[PDB]
Amino acid sequence: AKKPTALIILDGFANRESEHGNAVKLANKPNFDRYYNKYPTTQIEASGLDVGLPEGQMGNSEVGHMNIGAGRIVYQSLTRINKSIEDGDFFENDVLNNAIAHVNSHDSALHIFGLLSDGGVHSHYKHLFALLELAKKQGVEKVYVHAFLDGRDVDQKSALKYIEETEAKFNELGIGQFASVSGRYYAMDRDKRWEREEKAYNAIRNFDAPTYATAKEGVEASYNEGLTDEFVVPFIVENQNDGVNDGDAVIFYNFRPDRAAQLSEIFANRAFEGFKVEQVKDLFYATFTKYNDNIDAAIVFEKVDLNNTIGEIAQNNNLTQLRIAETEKYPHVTYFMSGGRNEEFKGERRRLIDSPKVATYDLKPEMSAYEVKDALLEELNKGDLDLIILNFANPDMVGHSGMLEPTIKAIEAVDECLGEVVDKILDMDGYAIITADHGNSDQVLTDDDQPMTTHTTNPVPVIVTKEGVTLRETGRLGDLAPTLLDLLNVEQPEDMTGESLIKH
Kindly tell me which of 11 and 312 has the beta carbon lying closer to Mn ion.
Answer: 11
Among residue numbers 44 through 83, which ones bind Mn ion (CB under 5 A)?
A: 61
Contacts of 161 (CB under 8 A, 6+ apart): none
Known binding-site residue numbers: 11, 61, 122, 152-153, 184, 190, 256-259, 329, 396, 400, 437-438, 455
Comparing CB distances to Mn ion, the nearer of 256 and 466 is 256
CB of 61 to Mn ion, least distance (A): 3
The binding site for Mn(2+) consists of 11, 61, 396, 400, 437-438, 455
**Interior angle at CA 61, CA 491 and CA 148, nearest 5:** 125
How far, in Å, CA of 429 to CA of 427, rounded? 6
Q: Please, which residues have CB within 8 angstroms of residue 298's CB and are 6 or more apart in sequence?
A: 95, 98, 99, 284, 285, 286, 287
Of the pair 61, 84, the CB lying nearest Mn ion is at 61
Which one, 10 or 319, has the nearer CB to Mn ion?
10
Nearer to Mn ion, 12 or 402 (CB): 12
Binding residues for substrate are: 122, 152-153, 184, 190, 256-259, 329
Nearer to Mn ion, 61 or 456 (CB): 61
Which residues are bridge partners to 351 per DSSP? 324
Instruction: Please identify which residue in 5, 6, 7, 11 interacts with Mn ion, judged by CB under 5 A.
Output: 11
Of 189, 379, 396, 416, the one binding Mn ion (CB under 5 A) is: 396
| Burial class of 89 by CB neighbour count within 10 A (0 to 12, 13 to 18, 19+) | exposed
Piece of 5-13, 137-145, 311-319, 442-450 that binds Mn ion (CB under 5 A): 5-13
**103 — phi, psi (to 5°)?**
-65, -50
Which is closer to Mn ion, CB of 13 or CB of 39?
13
Shorter beta-carbon distance to Mn ion: residue 61 or 241: 61
Q: Dihedrals φ, ψ of 464, to 5°? A: -120, 120
Helix (H, G, I), strand (E, B) or coil at 263: helix
Residue pair 323/315 in contact by the 8 Å Cβ criterion: no
Candidates 197, 198, 362, 437; binder of Mn ion (CB under 5 A) is 437
Least distance between Mn ion and beta carbon 219 (Å): 33
Residue 58 CB, nearest approach to Mn ion (Å): 10
- 26 contacts: CB under 8 Å, gap ≥ 6: 19, 404, 408
Using Cβ positions, the residue closest to Mn ion within the complex turns out to be 61
Stretch that binds Mn ion, among 86-94, 112-120, 351-359, 431-439 (CB under 5 A): 431-439
Question: Rounded to whole angstroms, what are the CA distances from 205 to 146, 172, 246, 503?
Answer: 10, 26, 12, 62
| Count of residues making up the chain | 504
The C-alpha atoms of residue 146 and residue 75 are separated, in whole angstroms, by 28
Report yes or no: 6 and 387 within 8 Å, Cβ to Cβ: yes
CB of 477 to Mn ion, least distance (A): 11
Angstrom distance (rounded) from CA 459 to CA 45: 5
Q: With CA atoms as reference, report the closest residue to 48 among 447, 470, 481, 438.
A: 438
Determine phi and psi for 236, rounding to 5 degrees. Answer: -100, 145
CB of 332 to Mn ion, least distance (A): 7
Q: Closest approach of Cβ 446 to Mn ion, in Å?
A: 18
Applying the rule CB under 5 A, the residues between 12 and 31 that interact with Mn ion are 12
Instruction: Please report how close the Cβ of residue 175 comes to Mn ion at its closest, in angstroms.
Output: 42
Q: Mask of contacts with Mn ion, 337-356, x by CB under 5 A?
A: --------------------
| Count of other CB atoms within 10 angstroms of residue 460 | 28
Q: In terms of C-beta density within 10 A (0-12 exposed, 13-18 middle, 19 or more buried), how is residue 373 classed?
A: buried
Residue placing its CB nearer to Mn ion in the complex, 12 or 340 = 12
Beta strands in 133-280 (DSSP E): 143-149, 177-183, 211-212, 235-237, 249-252
Residue 442 binds Mn ion, judged by CB under 5 A: no
Report the alpha-carbon distance of residue 70 to residue 354 in Å, rounded.
26
Identify whether the C-beta of residue 109 lies closer than 8 Å to the C-beta of residue 142: yes
Q: How many residues bind Mn ion (CB under 5 A)?
A: 5
CB 482 within 8 A of CB 71: yes
Active site residues: 61
Cβ of residue 11: shortest distance to Mn ion, in angstroms? 4
Q: How far is the CB of 46 from Mn ion (least distance, A)?
A: 9
Residue 223: in which H helix or E strand, if any?
helix 215-224
Q: Binding to Mn ion (CB under 5 A): which residues in 281-320?
A: none
> What are the residues binding Mn ion (CB under 5 A)?
11-12, 61, 396, 437
